[PDB]
Design a protein around this nucleic acid. Sequence first.
RNA 1: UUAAUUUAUUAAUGCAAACACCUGCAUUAAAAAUUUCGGUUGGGGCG
RNA 2: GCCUGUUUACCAAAAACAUCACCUCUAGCAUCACCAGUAUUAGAGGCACCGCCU
RNA 3: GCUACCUAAGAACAGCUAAAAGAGCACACCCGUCUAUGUAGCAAAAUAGUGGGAAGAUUUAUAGGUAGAGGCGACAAACCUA
Lengths: 238, 95, 51, 240, 45
Amino acid sequence: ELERVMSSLLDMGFSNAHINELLSVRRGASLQQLLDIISEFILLGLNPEPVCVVLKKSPQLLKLPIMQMRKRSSYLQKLGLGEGKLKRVLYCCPEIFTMRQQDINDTVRLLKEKCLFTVQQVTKILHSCPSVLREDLGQLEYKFQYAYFRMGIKHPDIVKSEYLQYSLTKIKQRHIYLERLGRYQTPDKKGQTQIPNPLLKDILRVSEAEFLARTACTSVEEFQVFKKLLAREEEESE
Amino acid sequence: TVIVERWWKVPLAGEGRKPRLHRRHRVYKLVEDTKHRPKENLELILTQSVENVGVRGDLVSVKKSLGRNRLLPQGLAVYASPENKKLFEEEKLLR
Amino acid sequence: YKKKWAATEPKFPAVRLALQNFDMTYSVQFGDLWPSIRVSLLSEQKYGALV
Amino acid sequence: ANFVSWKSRTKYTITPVKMRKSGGRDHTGRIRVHGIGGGHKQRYRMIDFLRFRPEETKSGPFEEKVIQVRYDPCRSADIALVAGGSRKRWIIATENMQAGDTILNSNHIGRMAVAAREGDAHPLGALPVGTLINNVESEPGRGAQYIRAAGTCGVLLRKVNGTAIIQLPSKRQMQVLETCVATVGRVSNVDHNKRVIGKAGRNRWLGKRPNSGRWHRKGGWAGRKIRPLPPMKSYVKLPS
Amino acid sequence: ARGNEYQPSNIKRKNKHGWVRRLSTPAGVQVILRRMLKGRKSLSH
RNA sequence: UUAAUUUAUUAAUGCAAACACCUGCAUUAAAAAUUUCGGUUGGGGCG
RNA sequence: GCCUGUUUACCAAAAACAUCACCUCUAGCAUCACCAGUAUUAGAGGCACCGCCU
RNA sequence: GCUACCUAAGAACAGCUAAAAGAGCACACCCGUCUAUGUAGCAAAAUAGUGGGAAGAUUUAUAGGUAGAGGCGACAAACCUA
Ligand SMILES: [Mg+2]
Ligand SMILES: [Mg+2]
Ligand SMILES: [Mg+2]
Ligand SMILES: [Mg+2]
Ligand SMILES: [Mg+2]
Ligand SMILES: [Mg+2]
Ligand SMILES: [Mg+2]
Ligand SMILES: [Mg+2]
Ligand SMILES: [Mg+2]
Ligand SMILES: [Mg+2]
């Protein structure tokens, strides 16, 4: 009943303002369902006002079956996504609760088995950039292997720089440019290079201006021409 | 049921003799698995009123699962054998 | 013939060998223009049309 | 092999039980776990992990007197012989449990939070949020399975509805019905980490033996390797 | 150093190669049957 | 082993099949299994 | 090479193997090993007592 | 029934020095460093001397277990009846 739900929401840290906001947000959702969903979200360690913000942004969450919501919440806790970690995840990609359990499981299994990311590294990836879950398999594996083999990056650095966050097209556009320019060299079998390579923050994190001014030391027009040429090369390769 | 077929043809045995099989005649290819066939329906004659199917004495095509799990075990239906059809025909004409 | 040797050379492909030769020579020859020349060489070639 | 598990006793008892070592072998006689063998002969003291076990023809919260706190060869945590009514049982002693102390075991989920005194067992619903706990059950009445090693302490992170969120010593959250019992405080023998084995012989006393060939797969141990994709085969191991 | 691999003990002898152990398994029963077919005076050890 | 050929078997998934368990069929792995080591030339090479 | 130990029974006893110590990875769990154990736990790998600077 | 490891329940370890020791010297015991002898030998791995450990991760009797692509292995490709 509304009495019980109001008492519970007075508990759990929710203030009357947010309670009224959520009650209005109810899109024909039963008070029982709303109470259960908020209960699961705060069980996941999420604060009351972020819960309110998330339900505002994505009311569909209230429509999720309680069984499925509980299963997904338990899975996220097992993956380590909880407490403050789940906040930025629910903002960057609020659809993790809607994704199929199989999609999440296979993404994590690709990250662990076929990519040899530690459990902590996997949690860090899913915490910093949940867009990986949206990104399809195969493409993700290609991106990781591009970082590992062709670029010579190791898992700690990949995770530290959030390399998986960036798009494969951008990654190739910058790295191949550097490589052909000779400013980047794939580490040899010994893992050494004639010249130290530029850092991934200098390669991908920075904007095109600084990227071409400090790391490549070339001209923007040259970079545009190279980008078009590389696009043609990829088209032909396919 | 899994239905299989020899890769290698077996030479004819004769009339009263039995075919002699060899190592190569134990190699099979699966021609079909019946469990993947499209589901067919079971013909039943109802005995008691049942929702959304019928009342009594009317031949009905019901999903085999329903027919074998609910109707027949509970006596709500009987097999559409010629004998049952005849008996329910006399029942109908006696009304 | 001596089948077993203490160490064998890396067995580079000819393309990489040419790249290494060019890197060690044209880099000195051209200074700061060598990266541009290198990327141009490694990229596609611009073809003119002679009627 | 003619291996029958020694864990055949059916009736709980205080007497230490003569336990047969396994050597890391299955009932088949083959090594299943490596590095196990030898060590000092040990006797097993049946530990009652169901702290709220009201005596026969009895019910409701009950108290118990700590007869003694003893070293257990089969655990990191030290145990306590504790007696109540007309029975005695072994439990896991908490950090400051002393002989002669009184311990309370209750199944009452009071509306208010019960004053959490180290050593007593209450349903998780009855504890203040943030209290240190150990010997936690996964289900009501299942029996303690988590937070049992020496010096370990989970935290009652949250309580909502009939569900409590606990932080296990591995810093992983766990959901348990608030009706499930747990005992307050951290497990005894908190200095277990700081113990220095000192010599290989001491591990051999503890029944750990140096053992090789721990994998039995062709080629032995093989760390996982990332199989390159066709595009990356060209750069897997670039010669210097 | 070598040669004395046989350290006799009637308990091990009977427990390892005795009639009861031979009959304990179909393989051992076939061992006995082969000895019988060959006509061995000593079927078991 | 990034030699060739397989995945029977397990582990995952997916699709059917029975309304957790199990059968069939696929895919990916793990584990393995089978098999091969062309010829002529070249002692201080890198064919 | 920290140490005492182990090893090629029958050409090698060693600097090799193990070893306390330390690091990394994996695992939130009961009725046949691990274990009648539960993250200060268990399994695996690496390294090498320890101590001082970068 | 050897050997590798393990299980059950046994046993042995003088004397001195030191004090509760993977402690020292050193018997029994275990091993096998070095040398010589022997090399169809006493011996299909021994003898003599020399030497290492010798209250321990020790040695050892008894019975049981693990079986061949398997076991077991303080990894020597060691051992699993010369
Ligand atoms: Mg013997
Ligand atoms: Mg040494
Ligand atoms: Mg030798
Ligand atoms: Mg020896
Ligand atoms: Mg020697
Ligand atoms: Mg003495
Ligand atoms: Mg000594
Ligand atoms: Mg050994
Ligand atoms: Mg070796
Ligand atoms: Mg070798």
